Amino acid sequence: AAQKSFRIKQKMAKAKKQNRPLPQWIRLRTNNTIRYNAKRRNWRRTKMNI
Amino acid sequence: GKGTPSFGKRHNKSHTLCNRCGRRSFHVQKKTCSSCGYPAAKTRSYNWGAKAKRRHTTGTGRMRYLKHVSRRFKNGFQTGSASKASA
Amino acid sequence: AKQSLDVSSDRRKARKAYFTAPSSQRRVLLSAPLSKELRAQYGIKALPIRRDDEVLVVRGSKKGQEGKISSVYRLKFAVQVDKVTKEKVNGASVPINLHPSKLVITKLHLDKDRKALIQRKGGKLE
Amino acid sequence: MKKVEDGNILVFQVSMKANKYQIKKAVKELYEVDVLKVNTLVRPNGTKKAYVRLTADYDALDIANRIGYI
Amino acid sequence: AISKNLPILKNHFRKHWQERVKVHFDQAGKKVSRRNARATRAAKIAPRPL
Amino acid sequence: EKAGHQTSAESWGTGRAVARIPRVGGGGTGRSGQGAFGNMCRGGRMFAPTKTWRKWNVKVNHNEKRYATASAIAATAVASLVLARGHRVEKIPEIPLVVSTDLESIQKTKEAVAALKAVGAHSDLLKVLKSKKLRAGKGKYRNRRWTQRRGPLVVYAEDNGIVKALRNVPGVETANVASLNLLQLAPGAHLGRFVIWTEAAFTKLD
Amino acid sequence: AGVKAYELRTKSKEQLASQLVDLKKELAELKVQKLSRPSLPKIKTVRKSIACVLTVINEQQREAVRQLYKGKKYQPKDLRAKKTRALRRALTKFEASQVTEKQRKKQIAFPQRKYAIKA
RNA sequence: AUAUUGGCGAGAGACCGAUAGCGAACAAGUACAGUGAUGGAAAGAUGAAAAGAACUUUGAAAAGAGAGUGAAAAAGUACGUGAAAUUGUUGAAAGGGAAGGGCAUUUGAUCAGACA
RNA sequence: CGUGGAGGUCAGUGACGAAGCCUAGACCGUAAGGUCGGGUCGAACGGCCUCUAGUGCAGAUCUUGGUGGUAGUAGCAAAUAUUCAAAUGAGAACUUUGAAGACUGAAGUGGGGAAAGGUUCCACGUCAACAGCAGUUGGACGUGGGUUAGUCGAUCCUAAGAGAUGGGGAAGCUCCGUUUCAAAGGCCUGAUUUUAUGCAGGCCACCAUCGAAAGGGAAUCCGGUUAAGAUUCCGGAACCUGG
RNA sequence: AAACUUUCAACAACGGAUCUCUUGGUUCUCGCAUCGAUGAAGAACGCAGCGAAAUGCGAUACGUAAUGUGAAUUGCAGAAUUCCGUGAAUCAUCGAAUCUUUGAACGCACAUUGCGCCCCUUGGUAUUCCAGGGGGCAUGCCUGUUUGAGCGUCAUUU
Ligand SMILES: [Mg+2]
Ligand SMILES: [Mg+2]
Ligand SMILES: [Mg+2]
Ligand SMILES: [Mg+2]
Ligand SMILES: [Mg+2]
Ligand SMILES: [Mg+2]
Ligand SMILES: [Mg+2]
Ligand SMILES: [Mg+2]
Ligand SMILES: [Mg+2]
Ligand SMILES: [Mg+2]
Ligand SMILES: [Mg+2]
Ligand SMILES: [Mg+2]
Ligand SMILES: [Mg+2]
Ligand SMILES: [Mg+2]
Ligand SMILES: [Mg+2]
Ligand SMILES: [Mg+2]
Ligand SMILES: [Mg+2]
Ligand SMILES: [Mg+2]
Ligand SMILES: [Mg+2]
Ligand SMILES: [Mg+2]
Ligand SMILES: [Mg+2]
Ligand SMILES: [Mg+2]
Ligand SMILES: [Mg+2]
Ligand SMILES: [Mg+2]
Ligand SMILES: [Mg+2]
Ligand SMILES: [Mg+2]
Ligand SMILES: [Mg+2]
Ligand SMILES: [Mg+2]
Ligand SMILES: [Mg+2]
Ligand SMILES: [Mg+2]
Ligand SMILES: [Mg+2]
Ligand SMILES: [Mg+2]
Ligand SMILES: [Mg+2]
Ligand SMILES: [Mg+2]
Ligand SMILES: [Mg+2]
Ligand SMILES: [Mg+2]
Ligand SMILES: [Mg+2]
Ligand SMILES: [Mg+2]
Ligand SMILES: [Mg+2]
Ligand SMILES: [Mg+2]
Ligand SMILES: [Mg+2]
Ligand SMILES: [Mg+2]
Ligand SMILES: [Mg+2]
Ligand SMILES: [Mg+2]
Ligand SMILES: [Mg+2]
Ligand SMILES: [Mg+2]
Ligand SMILES: [Mg+2]
Ligand SMILES: [Mg+2]
Ligand SMILES: [Mg+2]
Ligand SMILES: [Mg+2]
Ligand SMILES: [Mg+2]
Ligand SMILES: [Mg+2]
Ligand SMILES: [Mg+2]
Ligand SMILES: [Mg+2]
Ligand SMILES: [Mg+2]
Ligand SMILES: [Mg+2]
Ligand SMILES: [Mg+2]
Ligand SMILES: [Mg+2]
Ligand SMILES: [Mg+2]
Ligand SMILES: [Mg+2]
Ligand SMILES: [Mg+2]
Ligand SMILES: [Mg+2]
Ligand SMILES: [Mg+2]
Ligand SMILES: [Mg+2]
Ligand SMILES: [Mg+2]
Ligand SMILES: [Mg+2]
Ligand SMILES: [Mg+2]
Ligand SMILES: [Mg+2]
Ligand SMILES: [Mg+2]
Ligand SMILES: [Mg+2]
Ligand SMILES: [Mg+2]
Ligand SMILES: [Mg+2]
Ligand SMILES: [Mg+2]
Ligand SMILES: [Mg+2]
Ligand SMILES: [Mg+2]
Ligand SMILES: [Mg+2]
Ligand SMILES: [Mg+2]
Ligand SMILES: [Mg+2]
Ligand SMILES: [Mg+2]
Ligand SMILES: [Mg+2]
Ligand SMILES: [Mg+2]
Ligand SMILES: [Mg+2]
Ligand SMILES: [Mg+2]
Ligand SMILES: [Mg+2]
Ligand SMILES: [Mg+2]
Ligand SMILES: [Mg+2]
Ligand SMILES: [Mg+2]
Ligand SMILES: [Mg+2]
Ligand SMILES: [Mg+2]
Ligand SMILES: [Mg+2]
Ligand SMILES: [Mg+2]
Ligand SMILES: [Mg+2]
Ligand SMILES: [Mg+2]
Ligand SMILES: [Mg+2]
Ligand SMILES: [Mg+2]
Ligand SMILES: [Mg+2]
Ligand SMILES: [Mg+2]
Ligand SMILES: [Zn+2]
């Protein structure tokens, strides 16, 4: 980075967005089954291979 | 020092993202994707790689269009509009 | 026993078809028999349960009680009666969920269509 | 909002498909306002932002709470 | 791999024969439709025989 | 057929202080390293995986099916055998039970049941019904859920409505004389069904 | 509310173009509001509304073109039937029913006769 | 008339029953490894119903103790049953470089029967 | 003898408690095993005659999973170093502030960048896990804000090299060739004053394209400003390219 | 004598066997013949009042049109005019549409949101420069149209 391509920025941006906890009201829905965000992700725990 | 101290220079991509399959398998110097074959007009696959095949066949995706063909067929590819009735 | 080549007594096939039926289908599944009074009155045995119908539980604990259906909770395969409720320990109230096959219809809400429905089952109406 | 009080600049999230020209005209046309220059940038959530500076004929702050926000 | 006074066999199974096994499970079904087919044909063919 | 076998697992050979079953390749996943293919491995493949070309049907000499069916028919007289077989017949007038050909023409369940009662089938019919239990097996969730006894088996000469008038009452079976099945004549290979023969049917026998 | 389509379809080509702008002004404004109120579902029913109008506008323009082509070789590929790629290249019923000069003579002279055994 | 481990639609089984059955009954070709080709998991069950524990009390809190709900809390979102290895407490007993075992009986503990 | 399924039967057992598990209690059998009581439990299950097999485990450096002894043990000892007080907080060896003692000693433990990472930046909130003592602190958790360009880079150029095209090989996936055995193209203005662009000169035969954020290359500086941006904002003063 | 060790049990731990479940898997059978330059399969990025997935969709974005049904949706908020009705709905059906960036993928490129050309139109005192809106330009091959090339070659000029 520093000087990145718009493709990579985009990818990085989409990744920012997916990186939030389970929105706690899903937990309330009928038959809801999701306890937490299983596909979460940390910058120093898992590199996103571009 | 073929081990770790040599590992420390690992910081240049050999493959980037591949347009056609988005896979980080697009070999930069070779300018071809090691997964799907782009830009080879045909998509890369092999019969010794059935698991791979399965990972990418029709149906693994949206079928944005094929979805609807069987319904369309079911109705003899009808054209026009539905009319009206009562209740 | 089944005799058609297009019906299936396969249990697994049935249970899925139940639980995964669409809102539209649940409407008919959530039928509720008419009251003796109402049956002889429209000549109909039962009806898919409308909302603002008037009803009487004839099974379970809430047996005997009556009220207006407040919502048909199709998602839950369950019906709610405005008047049949739980009061939690903290005094807040909660609707008890009722199965329409355990109610009886005591007054229909009536539409052009609802009448029409009754007419169609070879019924008659007051 | 600071830019809008102190800088006489309207700030908009603005189409990623649109260039500095198109932001200029569209603002111009949507708001009666006249526009001096238009800096743009791509936010890190992948949406584009226009810093839009009005000429000193217009008071953007005034303009802002005409468009309705405060 | 030779012993006892047994006859000599010639059981030709050294190719991948498990790949080319036809079990006529469909024996009853093919009869049915065979019968069904003749039934439509008689129908179709007006009064001619079959 | 391809199960347990969907892996590129190689063995690690000896010298690695661990047994030699093939092991899943690669890493980062815990599946990786695990024993493969072997019939004793979790996720393995079964020993001698079942095939469809196993034999399922059996060929009986045609003449011997008849020896059996005949034999079987003969037992449906012998009242003690019928008795031994389940089948409440202390009350029935005489065996073989022959009943009027009028039976064959009855077209209404209620009416048909009525007849069956009248001629002595009551207590056997009631024996089914009183007998319906939940299949004890896992069978009970492979479309084999309930269980119950065999009723009487009504042989007729001409279906003038009868097979239909009965097709709903528990345990009663019907059979055109001209057929006659060993499976119905001696259910579970025990001789002596309770048969109610119409006259018509009885005379055709011969 | 939410605009009705069968009500749109009687409005003029431009009484419709305008209504589309009004909604756009509204919807725009609504979004200015959205970032003050904690919830603004009213917005949903006006972005659906816009779809509806646009639909009707594109709808009537197509029926326009579609007619002023009706009945002639060559009309724009996207008014041509969809069917199937293959279905499209199938022989037409005519060029398929086609029968050789000497064949029809034969078909005429000796066709399959309705007959019957027994008697 | 023949073929069909693909596709769309259907009826079935002396099939498997969550370490089984397809790798996947679950946000599974996912998560995760690998430069890449490729590799590739684990993971179902509160209850009829959330009625998911108001209120008090100790606590910084988590929680504990009461209360309360419920057919049951010996069901408390660690949730049906809840084995074993292995562990804590309580009770009983034995132990001079292992422990366990066989025949026999003392002693302690425990118990069936049979009596009229 | 024992298991999973199947035909028959006992109109078998059961929510008034099926199955399962527990039990140095009872009884039958030489034995495989079978039977009962009590506890736990909560929806099913068994006897007999037959049928059937994915039908019986202590071992296979067996497979998966779970668990011990080892053991509160080895250990947590490289990189000179810590100290007093206040503040905060339930809580302070470790957070903040002040004081002191030191260190790195411009070949830096300073001030920036290229690759790589992708929000770690900044603020607010905050300690369940994580930071092999701790934690009130953090690159953690929660919630948010933040990356402004005619002049900085890219973009243009060409380098090794890559690589379409007429073609020539190859059964074919494709291999060769890069101006090659090709009918390979676009420019300046006149001709227009039906009218917009046909024909009038003449050139020019170059013969794709990709390939440099260190090579080449049009042009911006200072001052001020932010929690976090700045040769990018604001201020002033310039310069380049096209028109 | 205790601690300690060991054995049995009771309660409580650990662990998740067992039993019972099953919207799944497997296998058999029957019926059927429908992808794509009218842009398929596949990819990327986006779209909800409050979503990160899965599912759905495409800037008309968990959807538009139509048709059937006949009152829901539901975790909360909401509409409230949607209830004897051209009408609820995360309904069903589906014949009409919209369908971002792409992909055989087609103006040229592509580790670039990189760089041309043509037509229409609008704005900027503009046939030439800049900017907005629309519509276009790959390859091989077939039939045809038109414009042509070759002393390949016929005839006709005076
Ligand atoms: Mg790693
Ligand atoms: Mg390389
Ligand atoms: Mg290459
Ligand atoms: Mg290509
Ligand atoms: Mg009905
Ligand atoms: Mg219910
Ligand atoms: Mg001001
Ligand atoms: Mg910029
Ligand atoms: Mg052979
Ligand atoms: Mg061999
Ligand atoms: Mg077959
Ligand atoms: Mg024939
Ligand atoms: Mg095999
Ligand atoms: Mg070892
Ligand atoms: Mg397996
Ligand atoms: Mg069992
Ligand atoms: Mg039974
Ligand atoms: Mg028969
Ligand atoms: Mg609507
Ligand atoms: Mg066509
Ligand atoms: Mg079948
Ligand atoms: Mg499994
Ligand atoms: Mg598995
Ligand atoms: Mg399931
Ligand atoms: Mg995981
Ligand atoms: Mg469980
Ligand atoms: Mg539940
Ligand atoms: Mg408590
Ligand atoms: Mg009870
Ligand atoms: Mg209990
Ligand atoms: Mg319980
Ligand atoms: Mg709780
Ligand atoms: Mg359970
Ligand atoms: Mg438990
Ligand atoms: Mg003792
Ligand atoms: Mg002894
Ligand atoms: Mg046995
Ligand atoms: Mg058995
Ligand atoms: Mg079995
Ligand atoms: Mg024991
Ligand atoms: Mg006893
Ligand atoms: Mg008991
Ligand atoms: Mg029990
Ligand atoms: Mg239960
Ligand atoms: Mg046997
Ligand atoms: Mg098994
Ligand atoms: Mg075995
Ligand atoms: Mg053994
Ligand atoms: Mg073992
Ligand atoms: Mg052994
Ligand atoms: Mg072992
Ligand atoms: Mg310790
Ligand atoms: Mg130590
Ligand atoms: Mg050390
Ligand atoms: Mg020390
Ligand atoms: Mg040190
Ligand atoms: Mg210290
Ligand atoms: Mg020094
Ligand atoms: Mg020095
Ligand atoms: Mg340091
Ligand atoms: Mg820096
Ligand atoms: Mg990083
Ligand atoms: Mg953030
Ligand atoms: Mg920080
Ligand atoms: Mg803590
Ligand atoms: Mg850390
Ligand atoms: Mg620590
Ligand atoms: Mg700690
Ligand atoms: Mg954060
Ligand atoms: Mg420059
Ligand atoms: Mg450029
Ligand atoms: Mg080449
Ligand atoms: Mg270049
Ligand atoms: Mg450069
Ligand atoms: Mg340079
Ligand atoms: Mg400065
Ligand atoms: Mg700022
Ligand atoms: Mg900075
Ligand atoms: Mg300036
Ligand atoms: Mg100036
Ligand atoms: Mg100039
Ligand atoms: Mg003493
Ligand atoms: Mg206990
Ligand atoms: Mg089980
Ligand atoms: Mg159940
Ligand atoms: Mg099945
Ligand atoms: Mg079939
Ligand atoms: Mg594909
Ligand atoms: Mg959704
Ligand atoms: Mg909604
Ligand atoms: Mg209508
Ligand atoms: Mg739908
Ligand atoms: Mg659109
Ligand atoms: Mg291209
Ligand atoms: Mg582009
Ligand atoms: Mg031509
Ligand atoms: Mg010509
Ligand atoms: Zn690819």
Swiss-Prot record, chain A:
Major localisation: cytoplasm
Keywords in alphabetical order: Cytoplasm, Ribonucleoprotein, Ribosomal protein
Cross-referenced Gene3D superfamilies: Ribosomal protein L39e
A GO biological process held by the record: cytoplasmic translation
Location relative to the cell: Cytoplasm
Compositional bias per record (Basic residues), positions renumbered to this chain: 6-19
GO cellular component: cytoplasm; cytosol; cytosolic large ribosomal subunit
Segments of this protein annotated with the region Disordered: 1-21
UniProt GO MF annotations: structural constituent of ribosome
Top-level taxon: Eukaryota
Signal sequence extent: none
Subunit description: Component of the large ribosomal subunit (LSU). Mature yeast ribosomes consist of a small (40S) and a large (60S) subunit. The 40S small subunit contains 1 molecule of ribosomal RNA (18S rRNA) and 33 different proteins (encoded by 57 genes). The large 60S subunit contains 3 rRNA molecules (25S, 5.8S and 5S rRNA) and 46 different proteins (encoded by 81 genes). eL39 interacts with YIH1.
Chain's role: Component of the ribosome, a large ribonucleoprotein complex responsible for the synthesis of proteins in the cell. The small ribosomal subunit (SSU) binds messenger RNAs (mRNAs) and translates the encoded message by selecting cognate aminoacyl-transfer RNA (tRNA) molecules. The large subunit (LSU) contains the ribosomal catalytic site termed the peptidyl transferase center (PTC), which catalyzes the formation of peptide bonds, thereby polymerizing the amino acids delivered by tRNAs into a polypeptide chain.
UniProt family annotation: Belongs to the eukaryotic ribosomal protein eL39 family.
HAMAP family: Ribosomal_eL39
Protein name in UniProt: Large ribosomal subunit protein eL39
Gene: RPL39
From Swiss-Prot, chain D:
Physiological role: Component of the ribosome, a large ribonucleoprotein complex responsible for the synthesis of proteins in the cell. The small ribosomal subunit (SSU) binds messenger RNAs (mRNAs) and translates the encoded message by selecting cognate aminoacyl-transfer RNA (tRNA) molecules. The large subunit (LSU) contains the ribosomal catalytic site termed the peptidyl transferase center (PTC), which catalyzes the formation of peptide bonds, thereby polymerizing the amino acids delivered by tRNAs into a polypeptide chain.
Homology family: Belongs to the universal ribosomal protein uL23 family.
Compartments where located: Cytoplasm
Coiled coil: none
Shown segment, full-protein numbering: 73 to 142 of 142
Gene responsible for this protein: RPL25
Assembly mode: Component of the large ribosomal subunit (LSU). Mature yeast ribosomes consist of a small (40S) and a large (60S) subunit. The 40S small subunit contains 1 molecule of ribosomal RNA (18S rRNA) and 33 different proteins (encoded by 57 genes). The large 60S subunit contains 3 rRNA molecules (25S, 5.8S and 5S rRNA) and 46 different proteins (encoded by 81 genes). uL23 is associated with the polypeptide exit tunnel.
Protein known as: Large ribosomal subunit protein uL23
Curated annotation (Swiss-Prot), chain F:
Membrane spanning stretches: none
Keyword Disulfide bond: no
Family: Belongs to the universal ribosomal protein uL4 family.
Name of the gene: RPL4A
Domains as described in the record: The eukaryote-specific C-terminal extension harbors a nuclear import signal and delivers the ACL4-uL4/RPL4 complex to the pre-ribosome, triggering uL4 release from ACL4 and incorporation into the 60S ribosomal subunit.
Protein name in UniProt: Large ribosomal subunit protein uL4A
GO terms (BP aspect): cytoplasmic translation
Subunit field text: Component of the large ribosomal subunit (LSU). Mature yeast ribosomes consist of a small (40S) and a large (60S) subunit. The 40S small subunit contains 1 molecule of ribosomal RNA (18S rRNA) and 33 different proteins (encoded by 57 genes). The large 60S subunit contains 3 rRNA molecules (25S, 5.8S and 5S rRNA) and 46 different proteins (encoded by 81 genes). uL4 is associated with the polypeptide exit tunnel. uL4 interacts with its chaperone ACL4 and the nuclear import receptor KAP104.
Cystine connections: none
PTM per Swiss-Prot/TrEMBL: N-terminally acetylated by acetyltransferase NatA.
UniProt subcellular location: Cytoplasm; Nucleus
Modified residues (Omega-N-methylarginine): R42
Portion of the parent chain present: 54 to 259 of 362
Keyword set, alphabetical order: Acetylation, Cytoplasm, Methylation, Nucleus, Ribonucleoprotein, Ribosomal protein, RNA-binding
Annotated source species: Saccharomyces cerevisiae (strain ATCC 204508 / S288c) (Baker's yeast)
Outcome of swapping R45E: Leads to a slower growth at higher temperatures but allows RPL4 assembly into the 60S subunit
Extra information: There are 2 genes for uL4 in yeast.
One GO CC annotation: cytosolic large ribosomal subunit
Swiss-Prot record, chain G:
Protein keywords: Cytoplasm, Phosphoprotein, Ribonucleoprotein, Ribosomal protein
UniProt GO molecular function: mRNA binding; structural constituent of ribosome
GO biological process, one term: cytoplasmic translation
Residue numbers carrying Phosphoserine: S12, S49
Compartments, record wording: Cytoplasm
UniProt cross-references to Pfam families, sorted A to Z: Ribosomal_L29 (PF00831)
Cellular component, GO, one term: cytosol
PROSITE patterns, alphabetized: RIBOSOMAL_L29
Assembly behavior: Component of the large ribosomal subunit (LSU). Mature yeast ribosomes consist of a small (40S) and a large (60S) subunit. The 40S small subunit contains 1 molecule of ribosomal RNA (18S rRNA) and 33 different proteins (encoded by 57 genes). The large 60S subunit contains 3 rRNA molecules (25S, 5.8S and 5S rRNA) and 46 different proteins (encoded by 81 genes). uL29 is associated with the polypeptide exit tunnel.
Function, in words: Component of the ribosome, a large ribonucleoprotein complex responsible for the synthesis of proteins in the cell. The small ribosomal subunit (SSU) binds messenger RNAs (mRNAs) and translates the encoded message by selecting cognate aminoacyl-transfer RNA (tRNA) molecules. The large subunit (LSU) contains the ribosomal catalytic site termed the peptidyl transferase center (PTC), which catalyzes the formation of peptide bonds, thereby polymerizing the amino acids delivered by tRNAs into a polypeptide chain.
Misc note: There are 2 genes for uL29 in yeast.
Entry-linked HAMAP family: Ribosomal_uL29 (MF_00374)
Entry similarity comment: Belongs to the universal ribosomal protein uL29 family.
Gene symbol of the encoding locus: RPL35A
